[PDB]
Design an enzyme around this catalytic site. Structure first.
Site, PDB file in Angstrom:
ATOM      1  N   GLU A   1      -9.261 -10.654  -7.414  1.00  0.00           N
ATOM      2  CA  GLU A   1      -8.448  -9.416  -7.219  1.00  0.00           C
ATOM      3  C   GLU A   1      -7.282  -9.454  -8.229  1.00  0.00           C
ATOM      4  O   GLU A   1      -6.952  -8.457  -8.827  1.00  0.00           O
ATOM      5  CB  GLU A   1      -7.911  -9.223  -5.778  1.00  0.00           C
TER       6      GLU A   1
ATOM      7  N   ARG B   1       3.020  -6.613   9.444  1.00  0.00           N
ATOM      8  CA  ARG B   1       2.306  -5.557  10.178  1.00  0.00           C
ATOM      9  C   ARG B   1       2.757  -5.443  11.604  1.00  0.00           C
ATOM     10  O   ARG B   1       2.955  -4.375  12.079  1.00  0.00           O
ATOM     11  CB  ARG B   1       0.781  -5.751  10.119  1.00  0.00           C
TER      12      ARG B   1
ATOM     13  N   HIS C   1      -1.875  -5.524   1.525  1.00  0.00           N
ATOM     14  CA  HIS C   1      -3.073  -6.256   1.353  1.00  0.00           C
ATOM     15  C   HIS C   1      -2.731  -7.570   0.657  1.00  0.00           C
ATOM     16  O   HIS C   1      -1.966  -7.598  -0.268  1.00  0.00           O
ATOM     17  CB  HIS C   1      -4.099  -5.417   0.534  1.00  0.00           C
TER      18      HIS C   1
ATOM     19  N   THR D   1      -5.205  -7.359  10.422  1.00  0.00           N
ATOM     20  CA  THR D   1      -5.494  -6.136   9.651  1.00  0.00           C
ATOM     21  C   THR D   1      -5.151  -4.870  10.432  1.00  0.00           C
ATOM     22  O   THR D   1      -4.472  -4.021   9.905  1.00  0.00           O
ATOM     23  CB  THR D   1      -6.965  -6.139   9.096  1.00  0.00           C
TER      24      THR D   1
ATOM     25  N   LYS E   1       0.835  -1.167   0.000  1.00  0.00           N
ATOM     26  CA  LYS E   1       0.000   0.000   0.000  1.00  0.00           C
ATOM     27  C   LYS E   1       0.882   1.232   0.000  1.00  0.00           C
ATOM     28  O   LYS E   1       2.097   1.109   0.137  1.00  0.00           O
ATOM     29  CB  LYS E   1      -0.898  -0.008   1.243  1.00  0.00           C
TER      30      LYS E   1
ATOM     31  N   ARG F   1      -1.501 -14.317   4.207  1.00  0.00           N
ATOM     32  CA  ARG F   1      -2.304 -13.766   5.299  1.00  0.00           C
ATOM     33  C   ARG F   1      -1.644 -14.015   6.653  1.00  0.00           C
ATOM     34  O   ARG F   1      -1.515 -13.073   7.386  1.00  0.00           O
ATOM     35  CB  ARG F   1      -3.788 -14.181   5.235  1.00  0.00           C
TER      36      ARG F   1
ATOM     37  N   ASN G   1      -1.990   0.069   6.980  1.00  0.00           N
ATOM     38  CA  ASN G   1      -1.571  -1.225   7.487  1.00  0.00           C
ATOM     39  C   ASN G   1      -0.618  -1.976   6.507  1.00  0.00           C
ATOM     40  O   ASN G   1      -0.585  -3.192   6.505  1.00  0.00           O
ATOM     41  CB  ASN G   1      -2.803  -2.047   7.872  1.00  0.00           C
TER      42      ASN G   1
ATOM     43  N   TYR H   1     -12.755  -2.544  -3.711  1.00  0.00           N
ATOM     44  CA  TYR H   1     -13.441  -2.444  -2.425  1.00  0.00           C
ATOM     45  C   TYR H   1     -14.974  -2.541  -2.546  1.00  0.00           C
ATOM     46  O   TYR H   1     -15.688  -1.851  -1.830  1.00  0.00           O
ATOM     47  CB  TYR H   1     -12.990  -1.162  -1.681  1.00  0.00           C
TER      48      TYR H   1
END
Ligand SMILES: [Ca+2]
Ligand SMILES: [Ca+2]
Ligand SMILES: [Ca+2]
Ligand SMILES: [Ca+2]
Ligand SMILES: [Ca+2]
Lengths: 151, 155, 155, 154, 151, 155
Positions: E125, E99, E112, E88, E11, E82, E109, E51
């Protein structure tokens, strides 16, 4: 002998970019011993005494944010740190060195180390930034393996 | 491509916990470990190792030093292995050694200079230091597949 | 001396250049290397090491794995070393090991899972595996001076 | 926002780890706001570990935090106290998860590398900062990177 | 099988702070194989389309700067990315996760990865952020050692 | 501060898990990624890139190599970016490259030398290489905040 000291400062660009731990560990890893460290702001008036030698841009920069000043101890500490930093202009500094790895500019060059070719600048620059009570005397056990000081 | 050099993490590097850092540096370069022994060096292996300095005032200390704690002895294999390991090591005296070298990053001393590698400018020093520190059966003969991408001839 | 466990980098982590990364983790934790051998493992030795899994259906693939190329076999000493190593390593199936662990960061497979460490939940397994892969003259007895700072009791 | 007191205890200084700890707090996104390398005296030590003037391990605990210099720090940020306790790992490095600072570096209760004000003990952050540092030694500053660490400074 | 793919992205907060390579390193060090990678800026439309399920902070954040969009292939890659990313809210995330080590906020964060429990989300995605021509199909020899059945 | 160079992690570095490492090195220098693309080069694109070399013996081994697997193509921006990337790459033969450079730490070969950078001593190479591998839609103009701490002139 191994009680020689030098002054090392991480400048505002270093501190802003989160490079203080990085700079600290390369000097630790090298075997030099920290005897002083403080996170301080430098006042125009202290900047003026340091760079008493574009003058008013290098003041504006050394005063533009917090610095992390340090004193470092060990064999030929002044030369060693200055080899470790690479050339003052980070654009010409060799990969492997602090400026050659993290830097791409002359004025924002990450750090200051006392010059080993201007005699005494090591003791001058620590007297200026630290007092004898902010400085520690201690024995780093591992210095016995850093040098013939050994068992 | 089968050139081999002998390399040792000296007592000082073992004590400071840099065995891993140093191995990492050599596998990171593309070189293949073919032997590796954690040992103490006896007084005679040491006299044999430093034999060329028998006449010298600095020969007692050397021997005391190298036998003052365990070493991690190694052989590495690769193209031009011997010189390669000498380049990453840096100058013998760590104080003179370029940052980016093992000695320039980690060492500040001539005696306690972290590490040894066979001298390339001394022919057969490499294979001789190997036989000295290692038996034939301790050296391991393997095909590391990642060499097809370290080396153009192995592609 | 203190407690001691057998630790082994498996053929996969040797092939992937992670030996040094693995050694560094155990070193910076505070643990003291006491044995270290680059070596190949034969079916016989593999049968004796994974003796207990002889009936299970993944035995023959398991043995083929640790004999498929070299390993880096070690012994580590320190307080609670057998337990600390197994927490450092993480769960046996790397897809379930947690980030921060060797297996969590470095692998994702259960067969090719990087490292072996003695099971601290299996009494004396450490001592049995040490005696299997090493003999006593391969295990250096030394005083790692930075252990005085790793441990209050030792200082 | 929140500040917290974090100290690299003498074991971590000695072992050459002050750079590593400082880096992990930097990369987490917290803001160094004071820091000072110093020797602790028995008076300051008796005062810091005053919750335990009653226990038997006290005499030895104070011999330790004065056995060598420490690197005394203050860090600012969203939940800076829980977060630096979260990164430190359990008090006993032996139970500390790998990933944390004690889990990676430590193998002991009493030599456990680092201190970070307790976040359940409401007001131990202010007290411990007040105890190690005077306010002239504390630098206020705007760190331009925090605008990307936090979606409240963006 | 080993062809599972998942979408991952650094991000804008992660690009600004110079952690693109730190994140890539973590994922390649785990044995995942990169098959897609593209430095790119997300227009508000694609943002809205990504989103869908949900929002005004999100869009403003993900179009705030360039991202590095990726696609990695490997056994159970969706789940593994993940686990490697962490919770998150990077304040609840465990140290050792991306994170946990890098983040202190949940808006910002860092990264993704596709939700492994929201079925088909991975393939969606991906198929959204990459045209199929930008996805590279190669054999990483190192996978013969990452994975037993690929040996 | 607007100068750009093309850089490309070659099939060997891709294959050995080094994309991230290289990307970190450039990020850490304070240079700014402006493009970035994981891709296969075909024979004809490899011919356009290494056209300055149709003549030489190694030509066909070179395109063989550059098309043997995917590469990671990039454009970086910063003051003096073409020359700074070359200083960090090191000498083109990895065996001569100083430790601390990319090729110094990571490589051991001429053909498999990990990375390409635009030669700063060939006016127009950086832009010709950028225009060849990328279109302008793919390059991203953005403002790196940290730049104002990397460079004095941006603050
Ligand atoms: Ca000799
Ligand atoms: Ca035995
Ligand atoms: Ca026997
Ligand atoms: Ca174009
Ligand atoms: Ca075009």
């Amino acid at each position: 002998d191994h009680d020689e000291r030098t002054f090392v400062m991480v400048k505002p660009d270093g501190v802003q970019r989160g490079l203080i731990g990085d700079i600290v560990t390369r000097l630790e890893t090298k075997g030099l011993k920290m005897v002083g460290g403080k996170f301080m702001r430098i006042d125009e008036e202290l900047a003026h005494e340091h760079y008493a030698e574009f003058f008013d841009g290098l003041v504006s920069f050394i005063t533009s944010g917090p610095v992390f000043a340090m004193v470092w101890e060990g064999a030929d500490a002044t030369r060693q740190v200055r080899q470790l930093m690479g050339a003052t202009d980070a654009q010409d500094a060799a990969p492997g060195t602090i400026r050659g790895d993290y830097g791409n500019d002359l004025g924002h060059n990450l750090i200051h180390g006392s010059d080993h070719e201007d005699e005494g600048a090591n003791e001058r620059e620590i007297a200026l930034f630290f007092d004898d009570d902010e400085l520690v005397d201690w024995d780093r056990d591992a210095s016995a393996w850093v040098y013939e000081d050994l068992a």
